[PDB]
Amino acid sequence: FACKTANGTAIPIGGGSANVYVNLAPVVNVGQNLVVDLSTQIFCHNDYPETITDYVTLQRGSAYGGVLSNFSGTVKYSGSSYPFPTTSETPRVVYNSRTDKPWPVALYLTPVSSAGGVAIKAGSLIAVLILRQTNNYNSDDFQFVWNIYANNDVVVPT
Numbered sequence: 001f002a003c004k005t006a007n008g009t010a011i012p013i014g015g016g017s018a019n020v021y022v023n024l025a026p027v028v029n030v031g032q033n034l035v036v037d038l039s040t041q042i043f044c045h046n047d048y049p050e051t052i053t054d055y056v057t058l059q060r061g062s063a064y065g066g067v068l069s070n071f072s073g074t075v076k077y078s079g080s081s082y083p084f085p086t087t088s089e090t091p092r093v094v095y096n097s098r099t100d101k102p103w104p105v106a107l108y109l110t111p112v113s114s115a116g117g118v119a120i121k122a123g124s125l126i127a128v129l130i131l132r133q134t135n136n137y138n139s140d141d142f143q144f145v146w147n148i149y150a151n152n153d154v155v156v157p158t
């Protein structure tokens, strides 16, 4: 089990860390959502699908910078949504193919009442998402740590 990103970096067997750089809607109103879809950013696969079933969770999702200060919301994982920043570990998604498969995580972030002006700065860390991978074969329990950075400013109109 290993993963790759849309910026040409990777995390090998056993886990580790990578940076992810996301383009963001440049304008988000109070009462609306900024959607940060990581399923176009992070992809993983199973290295022995004939024999091994890989299990993948979102173990933890943390907010940083402008997201931490200026937004609240939820994270959608494989069709179900949970509070973000996270308060538990999600259910498992199965990886059962050698073919790249997206990690089905998306953030739905809505501005807090006091947000206004530039609410997320270009280049800044906005989140850290921990993918936990286990399997039905051995005791492997690995963390794939994804540091999510904004490519651009996000403005919340006054």
Ligand SMILES: CNC(=O)c1cccc(-c2ccc(O[C@H]3O[C@H](CO)[C@@H](O)[C@H](O)[C@@H]3O)c(C)c2)c1
Pocket (backbone or CB within 6 Å): 001, 002, 013, 014, 045, 046, 047, 048, 049, 050, 052, 053, 054, 134, 135, 137, 138, 140
């Ligand atoms: C055709 N293959 C073969 O004959 C063949 C023979 C002997 C061994 C393997 C093989 C390959 C990879 C293995 O572990 C890695 O991949 C797993 C699936 O993604 C993960 O669950 C693990 O955590 C880890 O990342 C493991 C444990 C075994 C394969």
